[PDB]
Design a protein around this motif. Structure first.
Motif, PDB file in Angstrom:
ATOM      1  N   UNK A  72     -16.862 -12.476  79.110  1.00  0.00           N
ATOM      2  CA  UNK A  72     -17.928 -12.184  80.067  1.00  0.00           C
ATOM      3  C   UNK A  72     -18.763 -11.024  79.540  1.00  0.00           C
ATOM      4  N   UNK A  73     -20.012 -11.262  79.111  1.00  0.00           N
ATOM      5  CA  UNK A  73     -20.646 -12.585  79.088  1.00  0.00           C
ATOM      6  C   UNK A  73     -20.241 -13.417  77.874  1.00  0.00           C
ATOM      7  N   UNK A  74     -20.208 -14.744  78.026  1.00  0.00           N
ATOM      8  CA  UNK A  74     -19.829 -15.592  76.887  1.00  0.00           C
ATOM      9  C   UNK A  74     -20.886 -15.640  75.798  1.00  0.00           C
ATOM     10  N   UNK A  75     -22.161 -15.473  76.146  1.00  0.00           N
ATOM     11  CA  UNK A  75     -23.264 -15.497  75.184  1.00  0.00           C
ATOM     12  C   UNK A  75     -24.077 -14.219  75.377  1.00  0.00           C
ATOM     13  N   UNK A  76     -23.835 -13.232  74.520  1.00  0.00           N
ATOM     14  CA  UNK A  76     -24.545 -11.965  74.603  1.00  0.00           C
ATOM     15  C   UNK A  76     -25.888 -12.057  73.889  1.00  0.00           C
ATOM     16  N   UNK A  77     -26.853 -11.287  74.382  1.00  0.00           N
ATOM     17  CA  UNK A  77     -28.191 -11.262  73.811  1.00  0.00           C
ATOM     18  C   UNK A  77     -28.263 -10.240  72.685  1.00  0.00           C
ATOM     19  N   UNK A  78     -28.976 -10.599  71.617  1.00  0.00           N
ATOM     20  CA  UNK A  78     -29.129  -9.715  70.469  1.00  0.00           C
ATOM     21  C   UNK A  78     -30.278  -8.728  70.628  1.00  0.00           C
ATOM     22  N   UNK A  79     -31.099  -8.874  71.665  1.00  0.00           N
ATOM     23  CA  UNK A  79     -32.229  -7.987  71.916  1.00  0.00           C
ATOM     24  C   UNK A  79     -31.963  -7.072  73.108  1.00  0.00           C
ATOM     25  N   UNK A 117     -26.498 -14.857  70.854  1.00  0.00           N
ATOM     26  CA  UNK A 117     -27.653 -15.742  70.825  1.00  0.00           C
ATOM     27  C   UNK A 117     -28.921 -14.901  70.870  1.00  0.00           C
ATOM     28  N   UNK A 118     -29.885 -15.260  70.035  1.00  0.00           N
ATOM     29  CA  UNK A 118     -31.165 -14.569  69.973  1.00  0.00           C
ATOM     30  C   UNK A 118     -32.195 -15.306  70.812  1.00  0.00           C
ATOM     31  N   UNK A 119     -33.324 -14.665  71.101  1.00  0.00           N
ATOM     32  CA  UNK A 119     -34.363 -15.313  71.907  1.00  0.00           C
ATOM     33  C   UNK A 119     -35.084 -16.381  71.108  1.00  0.00           C
ATOM     34  N   UNK A 120     -35.390 -17.522  71.725  1.00  0.00           N
ATOM     35  CA  UNK A 120     -36.115 -18.576  71.005  1.00  0.00           C
ATOM     36  C   UNK A 120     -37.527 -18.135  70.652  1.00  0.00           C
ATOM     37  N   UNK A 121     -37.948 -18.461  69.432  1.00  0.00           N
ATOM     38  CA  UNK A 121     -37.111 -19.192  68.485  1.00  0.00           C
ATOM     39  C   UNK A 121     -36.825 -18.350  67.247  1.00  0.00           C
ATOM     40  N   UNK A 122     -35.963 -17.350  67.402  1.00  0.00           N
ATOM     41  CA  UNK A 122     -35.597 -16.451  66.317  1.00  0.00           C
ATOM     42  C   UNK A 122     -34.250 -16.866  65.741  1.00  0.00           C
ATOM     43  N   UNK A 123     -34.185 -16.984  64.419  1.00  0.00           N
ATOM     44  CA  UNK A 123     -32.965 -17.359  63.724  1.00  0.00           C
ATOM     45  C   UNK A 123     -32.212 -16.115  63.260  1.00  0.00           C
ATOM     46  N   UNK A 124     -31.038 -16.347  62.680  1.00  0.00           N
ATOM     47  CA  UNK A 124     -30.214 -15.259  62.184  1.00  0.00           C
ATOM     48  C   UNK A 124     -30.687 -14.813  60.802  1.00  0.00           C
ATOM     49  N   UNK A 128     -26.378 -11.957  59.632  1.00  0.00           N
ATOM     50  CA  UNK A 128     -26.175 -12.501  60.969  1.00  0.00           C
ATOM     51  C   UNK A 128     -26.081 -11.384  62.000  1.00  0.00           C
ATOM     52  N   UNK A 129     -26.271 -10.139  61.560  1.00  0.00           N
ATOM     53  CA  UNK A 129     -26.185  -9.011  62.483  1.00  0.00           C
ATOM     54  C   UNK A 129     -27.423  -8.923  63.367  1.00  0.00           C
ATOM     55  N   UNK A 130     -28.604  -9.112  62.787  1.00  0.00           N
ATOM     56  CA  UNK A 130     -29.864  -9.042  63.506  1.00  0.00           C
ATOM     57  C   UNK A 130     -30.495 -10.431  63.583  1.00  0.00           C
ATOM     58  N   UNK A 131     -31.780 -10.469  63.926  1.00  0.00           N
ATOM     59  CA  UNK A 131     -32.512 -11.720  64.051  1.00  0.00           C
ATOM     60  C   UNK A 131     -33.879 -11.571  63.401  1.00  0.00           C
ATOM     61  N   UNK A 132     -34.480 -12.711  63.070  1.00  0.00           N
ATOM     62  CA  UNK A 132     -35.795 -12.737  62.447  1.00  0.00           C
ATOM     63  C   UNK A 132     -36.481 -14.050  62.799  1.00  0.00           C
ATOM     64  N   UNK A 133     -37.776 -14.114  62.500  1.00  0.00           N
ATOM     65  CA  UNK A 133     -38.580 -15.270  62.870  1.00  0.00           C
ATOM     66  C   UNK A 133     -38.166 -16.505  62.075  1.00  0.00           C
ATOM     67  N   UNK A 134     -38.353 -17.669  62.689  1.00  0.00           N
ATOM     68  CA  UNK A 134     -38.013 -18.940  62.061  1.00  0.00           C
ATOM     69  C   UNK A 134     -38.926 -19.230  60.874  1.00  0.00           C
TER      70      UNK A 134
END
Lengths: 301, 431, 54, 301
Positions: A72-79, A117-124, A128-134
């Motif tokens: 809890x939570x099962x899917x944490x936000x990266x932002x 999980x990152x906000x759409x539509x950002x990939x890993x 895999x620690x942060x996120x970046x644009x597709x």
């Protein structure tokens, strides 16, 4: 050979929380199924442990097996900002994540299904620690750990990490190191029993003890490709169960064959049995054993 | 029986203590040295922390002096029985040529035996020619041919494994007890190392061995006793020799697998036009197994089998002089100061003095709580550790002395306060 | 090999045995072998005179 | 440890008085701009010293750092008559230099940066002695020698050139050779201290003490492809800064990092730290160690 690579005995549900884009094709898991959270598990040159122990369970299949609860939570936000549960256990990782992926699930210290999980539509990113644009974006997650499970029920609330001479490994605060900490990225296994913590190991010794168990049989539908059919629906001889079952001489010698009254075909399989683990000398039954690449801080002196 | 005969103190260079949760713990990142105990005696390891009462011990129980053997070239063997199959065909009919059966290969299935089935055994194919004419039921004037298809199968329900020993390794089965109380039974031979929870251990000094072991072959039986034969190891398997048909595994003999070895031109045949009786003069190893069954009397030693772990041993009648290397792979040793009481009493003191055996002591420890008891003398050369629980139990261990009139004062405690205790007993001279 | 068990081991000579049984100082014939001070290297001490030219 | 050979710590200036026609693309030195006094130092397999000491200063940046004095005149005019002070110091530097240049800096005897100049429209020849007429003309300065620069305040003004077997090197008059001498051309390294002389080196003994220094970390950016940003803007432990930055154990062990809340990624550098020298049998901390190819007059019977 190996005719039991994609067939999953028992349950076989790879449903992930947050990354809800593969609910149509994911439950169950058949031979001709599509799921990004299972295709990479049998890739040549990635997870040899899952290729060697293919006739077992996974992480999500263990969560849906009414034996492992979800975080809890099962899917944490990266932002997020401060207080992210999927930060300390994620930054200390080392396995490189492939491209065209957004979600990434793993196992936490408490023994629950933790995913990010990152906000759409950002990939890993690369780590895999942060996120970046597709290729195309996958409709699922990527297993960050090479672990497996089975049908076990032994308690392990009294067993802790047996890593002797180790200051701090991963995210657990074991003992206090007297010398200088030596930061080195190594491969340290882990083990999680029924409702227990992440018990790490040093020398994994797994043995297989096969016997007359109902998990050593499969069943596929007829064709006048292959499908999926639960083998637990076949009762004993001289009886009647829920669904009809049939097979050959090996499957009919123990279970009742309904001839044409069924819609499948039982065949003699194997690769099951009762797998044991070497924990503190006493051979126990593992439930969540595998490998995780974390940061190991050993003593220099 | 417990009782550390040789006791040594660990060095302070590899002993670093710490403090975590109102407890003083310390780890060991080195290797100590201690003399190997004899039959019955032990070899404790006194560990000191920051003060006097915090004292740990690691007892290593020695079973007996054994001399294990080192296996080298091994192979399985057993009895077999051939089965000759005859099939005579006329000349110039398919493959009934008198010249083809002469140079017929063994690994070539003929047209008259291609309907045998899944025969994954030691099979072969020969070709013996016979006569012809109308006297034996033949249409052609040319002589006929007789095809041979004989395969070997297993008829004995058991088998034997014949091996040798290149050197007698002095193996010592040690029952190492951890600091907390975990009992672990291992074994050490010559300079072999094992894997324990506290690290690793290996035998150091070794001055005991038996020469002349290559000229002796051993036979292992599944479950039953072993055997010994007074002959060198079997070289090449030839006709008329013990071990002419061998394999590699037990299943290769119990099922007669084609992956094994056999003597060439060994299966005899009786060419009788239409009849054929394939009989082999195989050597029966059960006769030698019954004539030479362990235990036996060889020189001044006793050769027998072994329990639990499969392997050959050699009972000796000499002294036990060896060294042990207790390698600690950086393992922490914790201890909790107990606070329960315990009123112990002396019982008897029997045994011997001036020897590696020791003397058995009797103590009636009466405590009210589950804990541990620590005892020591005055100068600092004797230490006694015995478990304690709620009730009245009789304990004790093996003690060593160099005087028949033992009058040494002991200081035992169970919570902190130390009270005096005097022991006595008459011992005998034991070498 | 024991079906599922395995006991792998070696038979190497422990160098610390000879290192402890022959730890310096160890006299030989009529000299005294010992270590050096400062620089790493084996040396030897004698009881003779000093006859050299620089 | 990404190789970033464009970020210049400190001032980052590369210009000399009397010829400030390169203050637009080289003040400071960043990814944008084109300066011939810095682009020639990034050649592949040509200048291994600058590639090894990438996160260190040079000579002009050391002069603009107010830590060392400059020669007078700093830019000798090679076009004027009646000689010039920059003739006996550069004529002995028999080295190769490309054309289309107008300036060349080096080290004199008093430990000062002595350079030349070329007013429009004149360009340097193959040797750099005189200026001739002239395509674009590189208005910067071609470094005739390879060296670096760093921050150091260690005393050492009474330490001169200490060489053995060489009676005269470059242009300095060392020991007096009563016998004969042999004129040869060899590569002899040199060094400089805090307000001293051009101390040549006979036994090059250098070492690098990598320590947690502010000039040993490179900060990135967060988009949602990791470009450089700045290192002086990251907050410190107990201090204050602009945008929050994070990183591994090295960046977080000395500075402040919030991982998810941070907007920058500070990673450890490569080949940077405290660099000392071994001269006269004692360890000292110089300003810049370099080498050159001049005339070496050794002893001869």
């Amino acid at each position: 050979e190996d005719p039991h690579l994609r067939n999953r005995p028992g349950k076989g549900h790879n449903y992930i929380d947050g990354m809800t884009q593969e609910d149509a094709t994911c439950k169950p898991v058949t031979y001709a199924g599509a799921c990004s959270s299972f295709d990479v598990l049998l890739e040549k040159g990635k997870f040899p442990l899952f290729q060697s122990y293919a006739h077992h369970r996974t992480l999500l299949e263990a969560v849906h097996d009414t034996i492992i609860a979800k975080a809890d939570p099962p899917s944490c936000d990266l932002q997020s900002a401060h207080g992210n549960p999927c930060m300390k256990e994620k930054l200390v990782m080392k396995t490189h994540c492939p491209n065209d992926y957004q979600s990434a699930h793993y196992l936490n210290n408490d023994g629950k299904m933790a995913s990010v999980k990152c906000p759409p539509k950002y990939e890993l990113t690369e780590d895999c620690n942060f996120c970046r644009q597709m290729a195309s974006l996958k409709k699922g997650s990527y297993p960050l750990q090479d672990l497996f499970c089975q049908s076990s029920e032994d308690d392990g609330s009294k067993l802790k990490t047996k890593m002797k001479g180790v200051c701090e490994v991963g995210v657990q605060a074991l003992k206090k190191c007297d010398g200088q900490l030596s930061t080195a990225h190594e491969v340290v296994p882990f083990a999680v029993f029924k409702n227990s913590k992440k018990v790490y190991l040093d020398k994994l010794d797994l043995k297989t003890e096969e016997n007359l168990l109902p998990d050593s049989f499969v069943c596929f539908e007829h064709k006048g490709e292959l499908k999926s059919f639960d083998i637990s629906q076949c009762p004993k001889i001289g009886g009647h169960g829920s669904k009809k079952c049939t097979g050959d001489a090996a499957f009919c010698s123990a279970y009742e064959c309904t001839a044409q009254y069924a819609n499948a075909y039982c065949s003699h399989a194997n690769g099951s049995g009762i797998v044991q683990i070497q924990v503190s000398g006493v051979w126990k039954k593992p439930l969540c054993v595998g490998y995780e690449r974390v940061v190991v801080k050993r003593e220099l002196s | 029986d417990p009782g550390c005969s040789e006791l040594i103190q660990a060095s302070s260079r590899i002993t670093t203590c710490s403090t975590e949760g109102v407890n003083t713990k310390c780890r060991l990142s080195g290797t100590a040295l201690i003399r190997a105990g004899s039959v019955g005696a032990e070899a404790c390891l006194m560990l000191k922390g920051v003060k006097e009462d915090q004292t740990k011990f690691l007892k290593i129980k020695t079973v007996s002096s054994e001399l294990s053997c080192r296996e080298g070239q091994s192979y399985w063997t057993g009895s077999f029985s051939p089965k000759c199959l005859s099939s005579r065909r006329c000349h110039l009919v398919g493959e009934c040529h008198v010249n083809r059966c002469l140079s017929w290969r063994d690994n070539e299935t003929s047209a008259e035996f291609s309907f045998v089935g899944e025969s994954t055994t030691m099979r072969e194919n020969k070709c013996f020619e016979q006569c012809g004419g109308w006297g034996c039921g033949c249409f052609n004037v040319n002589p006929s041919c007789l095809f041979v298809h004989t395969y070997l199968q297993s008829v004995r329900k058991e088998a034997l494994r014949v091996f040798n020993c290149i050197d007698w390794v002095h193996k010592l089965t040690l029952e190492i007890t951890d600091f907390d109380g975990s009992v672990s039974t291992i074994d050490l031979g010559a300079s072999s190392s094992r894997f324990t929870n506290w690290g690793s251990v290996s035998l150091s000094l070794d001055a005991e061995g038996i020469s002349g072991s290559n000229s002796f072959s051993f036979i292992e039986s599944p479950g039953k006793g072993y055997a010994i034969v007074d002959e060198p190891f079997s070289e090449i398997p030839r006709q008329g020799f013990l071990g002419e048909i061998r394999c590699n595994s037990e299943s290769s003999v119990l099922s007669a697998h084609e992956s094994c070895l056999r003597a060439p031109n060994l299966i005899s045949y009786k060419p009788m036009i239409d009849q054929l009786e394939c009989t082999t003069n195989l050597i029966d190893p059960f006769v030698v197994f019954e004539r030479g069954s362990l235990p036996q009397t060889r020189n001044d030693k006793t050769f027998a089998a072994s329990k639990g772990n499969r392997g050959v041993q050699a009972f000796s009648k000499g002294s036990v002089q060896a060294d042990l290397t207790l390698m600690f792979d950086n393992f922490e040793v914790d201890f909790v100061g107990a606070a329960v009481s315990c009123d112990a009493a002396f019982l008897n003191l029997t045994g011997c003095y001036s020897c590696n055996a020791g003397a058995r002591v009797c103590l009636s420890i009466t405590s009210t709580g589950t804990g541990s008891l620590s005892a020591h003398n005055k100068d600092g050369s004797l230490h006694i550790v015995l478990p304690s629980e709620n009730g009245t139990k009789d304990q004790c261990q093996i003690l060593h002395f160099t005087v028949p009139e033992v009058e040494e004062e002991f200081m035992y405690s169970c919570d902190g306060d130390e009270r005096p205790l005097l022991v006595k007993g008459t011992l005998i001279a034991i070498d």
